[PDB]
Write an enzyme that holds these catalytic residues in place. Structure first.
Site, PDB file in Angstrom:
ATOM      1  N   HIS A   1       0.785  -1.231   0.000  1.00 30.81           N
ATOM      2  CA  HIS A   1       0.000   0.000   0.000  1.00 30.81           C
ATOM      3  C   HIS A   1       0.824   1.294   0.000  1.00 30.81           C
ATOM      4  O   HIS A   1       0.247   2.380   0.033  1.00 30.81           O
ATOM      5  CB  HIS A   1      -0.957   0.033   1.199  1.00 30.81           C
ATOM      6  CG  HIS A   1      -1.948  -1.088   1.232  1.00 30.81           C
ATOM      7  ND1 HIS A   1      -3.201  -0.994   0.662  1.00 30.81           N
ATOM      8  CD2 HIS A   1      -1.888  -2.312   1.808  1.00 30.81           C
ATOM      9  CE1 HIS A   1      -3.862  -2.119   0.871  1.00 30.81           C
ATOM     10  NE2 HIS A   1      -3.086  -2.936   1.562  1.00 30.81           N
TER      11      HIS A   1
ATOM     12  N   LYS B   1      -9.062  13.541   4.319  1.00 33.08           N
ATOM     13  CA  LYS B   1      -8.142  12.401   4.337  1.00 33.08           C
ATOM     14  C   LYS B   1      -7.216  12.624   5.532  1.00 33.08           C
ATOM     15  O   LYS B   1      -7.165  13.730   6.086  1.00 33.08           O
ATOM     16  CB  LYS B   1      -7.318  12.325   3.037  1.00 33.08           C
ATOM     17  CG  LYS B   1      -6.584  13.632   2.680  1.00 33.08           C
ATOM     18  CD  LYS B   1      -5.925  13.634   1.292  1.00 33.08           C
ATOM     19  CE  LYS B   1      -6.932  13.754   0.143  1.00 33.08           C
ATOM     20  NZ  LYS B   1      -7.005  12.498  -0.675  1.00 33.08           N
ATOM     21  N   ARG B   2      -6.477  11.592   5.928  1.00 33.24           N
ATOM     22  CA  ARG B   2      -5.509  11.742   7.018  1.00 33.24           C
ATOM     23  C   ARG B   2      -4.480  12.843   6.688  1.00 33.24           C
ATOM     24  O   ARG B   2      -4.127  13.042   5.524  1.00 33.24           O
ATOM     25  CB  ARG B   2      -4.814  10.404   7.312  1.00 33.24           C
ATOM     26  CG  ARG B   2      -5.714   9.356   7.968  1.00 33.24           C
ATOM     27  CD  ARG B   2      -6.133   9.756   9.389  1.00 33.24           C
ATOM     28  NE  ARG B   2      -4.990   9.789  10.304  1.00 33.24           N
ATOM     29  CZ  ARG B   2      -4.662   8.810  11.146  1.00 33.24           C
ATOM     30  NH1 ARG B   2      -5.397   7.707  11.218  1.00 33.24           N
ATOM     31  NH2 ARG B   2      -3.594   8.940  11.928  1.00 33.24           N
TER      32      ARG B   2
ATOM     33  N   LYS C   1       0.401  14.095   1.225  1.00 30.92           N
ATOM     34  CA  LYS C   1      -0.943  14.397   0.715  1.00 30.92           C
ATOM     35  C   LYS C   1      -1.107  15.896   0.429  1.00 30.92           C
ATOM     36  O   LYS C   1      -2.068  16.314  -0.218  1.00 30.92           O
ATOM     37  CB  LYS C   1      -2.032  13.887   1.677  1.00 30.92           C
ATOM     38  CG  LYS C   1      -2.132  12.359   1.767  1.00 30.92           C
ATOM     39  CD  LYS C   1      -3.178  11.924   2.804  1.00 30.92           C
ATOM     40  CE  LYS C   1      -3.180  10.421   3.047  1.00 30.92           C
ATOM     41  NZ  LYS C   1      -3.752   9.646   1.907  1.00 30.92           N
TER      42      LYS C   1
ATOM     43  N   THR D   1      -8.608   6.236  -2.304  1.00 30.11           N
ATOM     44  CA  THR D   1      -9.953   5.682  -2.487  1.00 30.11           C
ATOM     45  C   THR D   1     -11.010   6.760  -2.296  1.00 30.11           C
ATOM     46  O   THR D   1     -12.093   6.682  -2.878  1.00 30.11           O
ATOM     47  CB  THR D   1     -10.254   4.500  -1.551  1.00 30.11           C
ATOM     48  OG1 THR D   1      -9.937   4.866  -0.205  1.00 30.11           O
ATOM     49  CG2 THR D   1      -9.457   3.272  -1.954  1.00 30.11           C
TER      50      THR D   1
ATOM     51  N   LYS E   1     -14.735   7.892  -4.251  1.00 26.23           N
ATOM     52  CA  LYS E   1     -15.979   8.266  -3.557  1.00 26.23           C
ATOM     53  C   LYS E   1     -16.559   9.591  -4.075  1.00 26.23           C
ATOM     54  O   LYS E   1     -17.782   9.701  -4.289  1.00 26.23           O
ATOM     55  CB  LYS E   1     -15.755   8.350  -2.035  1.00 26.23           C
ATOM     56  CG  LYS E   1     -15.223   7.068  -1.365  1.00 26.23           C
ATOM     57  CD  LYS E   1     -14.795   7.332   0.079  1.00 26.23           C
ATOM     58  CE  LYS E   1     -13.845   6.252   0.608  1.00 26.23           C
ATOM     59  NZ  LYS E   1     -13.398   6.551   2.008  1.00 26.23           N
TER      60      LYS E   1
HETATM   61  C1  LIG Z   1       3.355   0.562   9.411  1.00 27.80           C
HETATM   62  C2  LIG Z   1       2.595   1.720  10.046  1.00 27.80           C
HETATM   63  C3  LIG Z   1       3.472   2.970  10.055  1.00 27.80           C
HETATM   64  C4  LIG Z   1       2.221   1.359  11.490  1.00 27.80           C
HETATM   65  C5  LIG Z   1       1.326   2.043   9.196  1.00 27.80           C
HETATM   66  C6  LIG Z   1       0.038   1.706   9.641  1.00 27.80           C
HETATM   67  C7  LIG Z   1      -1.088   2.013   8.868  1.00 27.80           C
HETATM   68  C8  LIG Z   1      -0.942   2.662   7.640  1.00 27.80           C
HETATM   69  C9  LIG Z   1      -2.185   3.014   6.792  1.00 27.80           C
HETATM   70  O1  LIG Z   1      -3.250   3.284   7.351  1.00 27.80           O
HETATM   71  N1  LIG Z   1      -1.986   3.034   5.464  1.00 27.80           N
HETATM   72  C10 LIG Z   1      -2.911   3.322   4.526  1.00 27.80           C
HETATM   73  O2  LIG Z   1      -4.078   3.637   4.788  1.00 27.80           O
HETATM   74  N2  LIG Z   1      -2.481   3.258   3.266  1.00 27.80           N
HETATM   75  C11 LIG Z   1      -3.387   3.559   2.135  1.00 27.80           C
HETATM   76  O3  LIG Z   1      -4.042   2.344   1.638  1.00 27.80           O
HETATM   77  C12 LIG Z   1      -5.091   2.678   0.691  1.00 27.80           C
HETATM   78  C13 LIG Z   1      -5.788   1.357   0.305  1.00 27.80           C
HETATM   79  O4  LIG Z   1      -4.948   0.631  -0.597  1.00 27.80           O
HETATM   80  C14 LIG Z   1      -4.517   3.434  -0.533  1.00 27.80           C
HETATM   81  O5  LIG Z   1      -5.587   3.897  -1.360  1.00 27.80           O
HETATM   82  C15 LIG Z   1      -3.642   4.633  -0.112  1.00 27.80           C
HETATM   83  O6  LIG Z   1      -2.973   5.164  -1.256  1.00 27.80           O
HETATM   84  C16 LIG Z   1      -2.626   4.204   0.968  1.00 27.80           C
HETATM   85  O7  LIG Z   1      -1.855   5.320   1.433  1.00 27.80           O
HETATM   86  C17 LIG Z   1       0.337   3.019   7.196  1.00 27.80           C
HETATM   87  C18 LIG Z   1       1.459   2.706   7.966  1.00 27.80           C
HETATM   88  C1  LIG Z   2     -12.076   6.737   2.061  1.00 27.84           C
HETATM   89  C2  LIG Z   2     -11.601   7.176   3.431  1.00 27.84           C
HETATM   90  C3  LIG Z   2     -10.238   7.445   3.629  1.00 27.84           C
HETATM   91  C4  LIG Z   2      -9.255   7.346   2.500  1.00 27.84           C
HETATM   92  O1  LIG Z   2      -9.124   8.594   1.773  1.00 27.84           O
HETATM   93  P1  LIG Z   2      -7.867   8.970   0.841  1.00 27.84           P
HETATM   94  O2  LIG Z   2      -8.244  10.312   0.342  1.00 27.84           O
HETATM   95  O3  LIG Z   2      -7.834   7.907  -0.185  1.00 27.84           O
HETATM   96  O4  LIG Z   2      -6.724   8.976   1.768  1.00 27.84           O
HETATM   97  C5  LIG Z   2      -9.772   7.866   4.868  1.00 27.84           C
HETATM   98  N1  LIG Z   2     -10.653   7.997   5.925  1.00 27.84           N
HETATM   99  C6  LIG Z   2     -11.995   7.725   5.757  1.00 27.84           C
HETATM  100  C7  LIG Z   2     -12.919   7.873   6.930  1.00 27.84           C
HETATM  101  C8  LIG Z   2     -12.484   7.313   4.515  1.00 27.84           C
HETATM  102  O5  LIG Z   2     -13.695   7.073   4.391  1.00 27.84           O
END
Ligand SMILES: CC(C)(C)c1ccc(C(=O)NC(=O)N[C@@H]2O[C@H](CO)[C@@H](O)[C@H](O)[C@H]2O)cc1
Ligand SMILES: *Cc1c(COP(=O)(O)O)cnc(C)c1O
Ligand SMILES: CC(C)(C)c1ccc(C(=O)NC(=O)N[C@@H]2O[C@H](CO)[C@@H](O)[C@H](O)[C@H]2O)cc1
Ligand SMILES: O=c1[nH]cnc2c1ncn2[C@@H]1O[C@H](COP(=O)(O)O)[C@@H](O)[C@H]1O
Ligand SMILES: O=c1[nH]cnc2c1ncn2[C@@H]1O[C@H](COP(=O)(O)O)[C@@H](O)[C@H]1O
Ligand SMILES: *Cc1c(COP(=O)(O)O)cnc(C)c1O
EC number: 2.4.1.1
Lengths: 807, 807
Positions: free
Chosen positions: A348, A539-540, A545, A647, A651
């Site tokens: 990812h 988004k986060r 980003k 993603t 949406k």
């Molecule tokens: C390894 C650690 C640092 C604990 C960690 C833990 C969690 C995450 C995490 O939440 N990671 C993501 O959400 N990753 C997301 O995955 C989605 C689905 O494929 C993608 O659309 C997006 O581009 C990607 O950034 C990333 C890193």
């Molecule tokens: C879809 C969704 C995300 C992912 O959004 P990105 O713009 O792809 O990072 C994050 N948080 C929530 C609550 C979502 O629904």
């Protein structure tokens, strides 16, 4: 009220009403005279839950009889959100429940707002698992989601004085009506101990035991009577001075206490490692038990697929080896053949700080047998590399699962590639970058292993549920089949010149914006102009980003207004929302900057209602379902090559917003589907970023050559946005000027210019809406039904089915 | 099958069967093909629970309408045992459920054994609260039981190598179908902080908050449709680096984690103090809320009674003052008048080590405002003493609530007497001892305050439920009214010469013994002769209860057999059971001695089946319901003046055992009711113990003058009962010879002689049974219905009622 929400038959409405009253009385132990809205929510939830049960039991017994190949989706995150409306939608009960509750004198929408989100995830990866569960049930696959039942999910975000504050997400406080505890199916998980070698192989001894108790949640398919299971493990201490020993049980049970909210930087924390093994060890015992109840493990890969959602459950690979070799007594080579054919791995991210590299010393203490197995995997794997590329010593050190250095580490991604028959990225450009950069050596050794599976979202939650108005006007023209076959949306292209449809699309959007504008006033006391362009980035919070790039545009618009106040500009409501990882200092500074900009912009009399900057507090799944239908412009502005897919982008496309974005992740395929003329593309491509890296990125150049950018940096530095703390944003300025990994300045000019093109089109409502129709109509590829069908056929070796089970 | 268990009507049986199936399907989410006996238990439990709900809601609304005076019974212990059978008995559903389950192919008795005991108590005090709840509901009082929902109750006792091992009593593991969580009624409790004095009185500030979440359990009256509430509080952390802060929530929630199992020695442990305040603070907010929903607190004592079960909830007194003075702004004198008229205190022991004396420094830190209030209570109280007894300076120091010394302490018993309008002991002799010894000064100041309320047991659980055979043969002769009017048992005296009744009483006992003999083999693999005299001592292990005296008799019988093997002796099965407090070394040694005696006695071929010594493992309420109906001889052999009442003694009397005992506690009144000729009384009276104390107790004298006693002590010392550790029992010997507070040797000769009289009577079955009939017939006084009626009339100022509520 509306057709897509099903029938409200006299008999069903009568039946729901009496079961509602039965639950209020017998289940909640309340009478109408003291019942609160929360009591009414729970009565409805239990009534709807009853309709799942029959189908749940018959689906699971059907799998036992027919014995199909089982799919096990392993994830540390399931970002489920609310369950009530989703269940009604999938069971075709929404209109009936609406009518039944109306007749009892209750508003169902008000009752829906009472349910807590199951926020058992961070963002995209966790939400992907949730969409995937929905699609797998809809496509009739024998699929199981396996994870951890965290007592506390992602923190609730409070904003105090412009700063993020975290508070515990006590989501289980009032109970969870959807789950069923299964204490009878509790399994032991082992930790620590030591390895003993005997005549007959190795033995793992002197371990500490933690119990894994499963909780099962139903996952209904869309109107097919299929109900699959999400099984989440809870940590329990075994039952064997006195007072302290009892209180110390908390130590074991802490394993399932809280979701780790860091999504930016890998920290090798011991409790996190315990979580990862816990889910893996309990799940694999379940898998093997279910397989044995069908001696001979040759058929194991014919009956079992294990999908690893990132490297977080990567310990599945050495754990499967441990069980097959140490317990079942299979020879190494046969066990390995089985393991590889069983496991598949999804990546990812390409950002090195987000990749798991566990210190050897932690694994040595916690999981001594697993470390031995990893070393053995590594030796055998490197023997294959050496035979394939004789004399290439650097390749050997590059491909090793063991990383040498100050502290020795295991590269979990390398372990996953070695132990899986399939490795996939999550969007075409991402999967290409994997093959060309970080996994190049592995691709050269085993090209067949590498695949693409472009991400998708479920159109049930992300259209029908959150945007019933749009779902209805679509159904009027083309019927209802598109809900489980999203490609049918292409039929909408023949309505692009239809005056009635144009007006309806525009009407649905306006209604969504009015509704969200009212939500903001009621819940947060913030006043917005519903006629403005809704400019949304949710988004986060991450540097990659580039919420910071958005901030720079916002300040540019403000400065332009202040320079020429009496000149016309398209009014905008700029909304930015998202949580920052608690230890991510820069992300917390970015949130503070956003609110600080708002404090100045929202109170300038000269600006008026022409520009508003709002930080959307506590962004989560339930909030996404509200804001996304209301958006006009979707901000997808990551540095090219950094966002694996995205993603949220999908949406917004499904819900009638136009997209401004870079050629990154799934944005590339979205623009391809809709046509580049129907997308607002700007900025460096991956190749341009590469050329800039080779040359050396110098932010000063941009500062020197763009007067408007210089002004903003001067404003930030001088304390224009923080009068009482003039140096508040010095960290941000310093980063931007001297160490910006994500080249914010390099895309500034093209971003601002592209934003002007957006405003120009918004001035012409008819052409805006026609472009919107072109987007909605070509969003079909981005259904998670499509994604899952590709996983099923190309990785798992199973055929999807839209065929209905008997009710 | 039997009449007292109610009707099995065609319509009710049909109805129960379908509700059983509905719960199995919808509630448990199981089908018949995979359901286990535990699943069947839960389905039955939920079906029976449904019948409580209607009555529960209507009882509570009836109290709201009619607004009667409310009784609040405050206890840190509720020793409830199992709930399923008790509920069926009180609702008249036992025969119907038996029939319904029989028709489904299930054995209800087998399903009953699956339920965990709610073991939320240590022994007599905790069980008294449970019996009292049953009687209060049966007598139609508006009564509420308030306590703590411990996650872990009294430890499960394992015996390993003859030693007690403790393990966590995880009673909530599979869930509790009887309770209803009420998270909506959660209340804050404050700790620590400091006291601030302002213009308008004191303020308690800078506190740490812990939330109190209530769980409600229904308490059904016997066939009167009254269902009262037991409300138990659970500790919850409030919702306001990150990971550690979340994990630290456990610190707050530890308050309700575990029941303190020390019932022998007061330890001033901080966590225990927190438990005591927690229950008191949450409960009082509930009381006041309910009172305000009826400004003027003059009527408070007319609408509220608070009964303190020992001093454990004594903080109710200064907490009520705090609320009335600090929050409601009443003047001190008026608040005190209200407090005294509201509160009453029950004492359960005269042993000084079991009395609560809290260090001032703990109260100072934890509850600074309460300490100030206590000091003020003390000053005003001592001013009254000084005015009543001018110049009596020693009386002033004796009566002070504050004890001076190495560490300053608060005497909680003195606080309770000062702040209560009634103080009672729990048996006539006990209440007299209070007036003559430890509370003499207080009695001289306020004679009107001091009362007796002799203890009792509920005849529902302790006859109808555990001994249906005896209940039935009684009902045949005199009908069913005695179950809620136990005095009617006197009518059985006219059957003492009835040959049919004699045979039936003897038959019921034999059946009980066979059933218990079978239970022992099945569950523990121990083989006993069912024709022997069942000699039973079951109760917590304490030096004052003199299990050691029993041990000495057992060894005497063994030595006599070994001396004259071919001589006839009445065969005995001697059963001793009970848990020891984990830190009570001597009690743990006593358990080891009992098993060690068994190891020698049970394996001597010369002894045969003439003598067997068995330690009954894990004694608890559910085990008491099995063993008590099977007993022939009840051992109640505490040193005169030490057992305040006893309640086990009453259970045995009701169930057809004869009693061997000292003139202690309720034994005195039992012998008075039955006639001394129908009781096996031996030993020193209180006065003889006093005379011996004045002279000085010298154990050596007894050792020197009784050859049979000398032999036993020599056997213990020499390692006869511990060949591999000859000095194992040196602590016991040393205690007996040099520092025995309870004068075991002084009662030895008379005990042994009395035991010979028991054996002599057992040789004549007809006369044994006639004496048994005389006991059962006069056990009526010892119904907790009688006890509660006396509390109601003489302390609470309310009238009991046997009048039925509408169904
Ligand atoms: C390894 C650690 C640092 C604990 C960690 C833990 C969690 C995450 C995490 O939440 N990671 C993501 O959400 N990753 C997301 O995955 C989605 C689905 O494929 C993608 O659309 C997006 O581009 C990607 O950034 C990333 C890193
Ligand atoms: C879809 C969704 C995300 C992912 O959004 P990105 O713009 O792809 O990072 C994050 N948080 C929530 C609550 C979502 O629904
Ligand atoms: C103060 C501390 C040492 C913690 C403590 C805690 C609990 C106990 C305890 O369990 N205490 C009793 O059970 N007490 C019992 O109460 C019953 C009922 O009146 C009487 O019949 C019996 O005579 C009496 O001993 C005794 C002391
Ligand atoms: O041994 C069995 N006999 C009959 N049905 C079974 C058996 N084992 C599992 N099932 C069915 O499969 C379901 C449980 O599946 P599992 O726990 O995921 O393996 C149950 O609902 C049963 O209906
Ligand atoms: O304000 C009220 N209106 C109507 N009934 C009430 C009200 N307050 C309490 N009750 C009744 O009393 C019960 C709760 O009592 P409480 O919580 O112990 O005070 C409920 O079951 C209601 O039936
Ligand atoms: C009745 C009872 C007691 C009290 O017995 P005493 O002999 O009065 O100490 C203790 N434990 C249990 C389980 C009881 O039922």
């Amino acid at each position: 009220q509306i057709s897509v929400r099903g029938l409200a038959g006299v008999e069903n409405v009568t039946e729901l009403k009496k079961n509602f009253n039965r639950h209020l009385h017998f289940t909640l132990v309340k009478d109408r005279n003291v019942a609160t809205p929360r009591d009414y929510y729970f009565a409805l939830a239990h009534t709807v839950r009853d309709h799942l049960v029959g189908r749940w039991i018959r689906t699971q017994q059907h799998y036992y009889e027919k014995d199909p190949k089982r799919i096990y989706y392993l994830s540390l995150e399931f970002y489920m959100g609310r369950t009530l409306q989703n269940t009604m939608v999938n069971l075709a009960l929404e209109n009936a429940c609406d009518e039944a509750t109306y007749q009892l004198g209750l508003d169902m929408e008000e009752l829906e707002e009472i349910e807590e989100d199951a926020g058992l995830g961070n963002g995209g990866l966790g939400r992907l698992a949730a969409c995937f569960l929905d699609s797998m049930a809809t496509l009739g696959l024998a699929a199981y989601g396996y994870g951890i039942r965290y007592e506390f999910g992602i923190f609730n975000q409070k904003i105090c004085g412009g700063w993020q504050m975290e508070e515990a997400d006590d989501w289980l406080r009032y109970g969870n009506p959807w789950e069923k505890a299964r204490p009878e199916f509790t399994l032991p998980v082992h930790f620590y101990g030591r390895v003993e070698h005997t005549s007959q192989g190795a033995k793992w001894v002197d371990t500490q035991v933690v119990l894994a108790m499963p909780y099962d949640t139903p996952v209904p398919g869309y109107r097919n009577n299929v109900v699959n299971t999400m099984r989440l493990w809870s940590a329990k201490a075994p039952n064997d001075g006195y007072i302290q020993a009892v209180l110390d049980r908390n130590l074991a049970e802490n394993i399932s206490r809280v979701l780790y909210p860091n999504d930016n930087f890998f920290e090798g924390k011991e409790l996190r490692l315990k979580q990862e093994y816990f889910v893996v060890a309990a799940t694999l015992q379940d898998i093997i038990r279910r397989f044995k109840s069908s001696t001979n493990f040759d058929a194991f890969p014919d009956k079992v697929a294990i999908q690893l959602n990132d490297t977080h459950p990567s310990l599945a690979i050495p754990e499967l080896m441990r069980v097959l070799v140490d317990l079942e007594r299979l020879d190494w080579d046969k066990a390995w053949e089985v393991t590889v054919k069983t496991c598949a791995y999804t990546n990812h991210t390409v950002l090195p700080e987000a990749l798991e590299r566990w210190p050897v010393h932690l694994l040595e203490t916690l999981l001594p047998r697993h470390l031995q197995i990893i070393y053995e995997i590594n030796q055998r794997f490197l023997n294959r590399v050496a035979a394939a590329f004789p004399g290439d010593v650097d390749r050997l050190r590059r491909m090793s699962l063991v990383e040498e250095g100050a502290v020795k580490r295991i590269n979990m991604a390398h372990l996953c590639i070695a132990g899986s028959h399939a490795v996939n990225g999550v969007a075409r450009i991402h999967s290409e970058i994997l093959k060309k950069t970080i996994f190049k050596d592995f691709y050269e050794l085993e090209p067949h292993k590498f695949q693409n599976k472009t991400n998708g979202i479920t159109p049930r939650r992300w259209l029908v549920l959150c945007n019933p108005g749009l779902a209805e006007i679509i159904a009027e023209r083309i019927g209802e089949e598109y809900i489980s076959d999203l490609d049918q949306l292409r039929k909408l292209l023949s309505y692009v010149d239809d005056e009635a449809f144009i007006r309806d699309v525009a009407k649905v959007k306006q209604e969504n914006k009015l509704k969200f504008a009212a939500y903001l006033e009621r819940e947060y006391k913030v006043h917005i102009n519903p006629n403005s362009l809704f400019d949304v980035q949710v988004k986060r919070i991450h540097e990659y980003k580039r919420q910071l790039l958005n901030c720079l545009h916002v300040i540019t618009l403000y400065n332009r207004i202040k320079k020429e106040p009496n000149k016309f500009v398209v009014p905008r409501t700029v909304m930015i929302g998202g949580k920052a990882a608690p230890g991510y200092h820069m992300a917390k500074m970015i949130i503070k900057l956003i609110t600080a900009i708002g404090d100045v912009v929202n109170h300038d009399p000269v600006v008026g209602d022409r520009l508003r900057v709002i930080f959307l507090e506590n962004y989560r799944v339930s909030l996404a379902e509200k804001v996304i239908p209301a958006a006009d412009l979707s901000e997808q502005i990551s540095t090219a090559g950094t966002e694996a897919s995205g993603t949220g982008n999908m949406k917004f496309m499904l819900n009638g917003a136009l997209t401004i974005g870079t050629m990154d992740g799934a944005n590339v395929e979205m623009a391809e589907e809709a046509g580049e003329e129907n997308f607002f593309i700007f900025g460096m491509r991956v190749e341009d970023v590469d050329r800039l890296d080779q040359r050396g990125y110098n932010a000063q150049e941009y500062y020197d050559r763009i007067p408007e950018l210089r002004q903003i940096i001067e404003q930030l530095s001088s304390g224009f946005f923080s009068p009482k703390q003039p140096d508040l944003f010095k960290d941000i300025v310093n980063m931007l000027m001297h160490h910006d990994r994500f080249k914010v300045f390099a895309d500034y000019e093209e971003y601002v210019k592209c934003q002007e093109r957006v405003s120009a089109l918004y001035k012409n409502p008819r052409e805006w809406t026609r472009m919107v129709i072109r987007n909605i109509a070509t969003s079909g590829k981005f259904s998670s039904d499509r994604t899952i069908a590709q996983y099923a056929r190309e990785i798992w070796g199973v055929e999807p089915s839209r065929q209905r089970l008997p009710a």
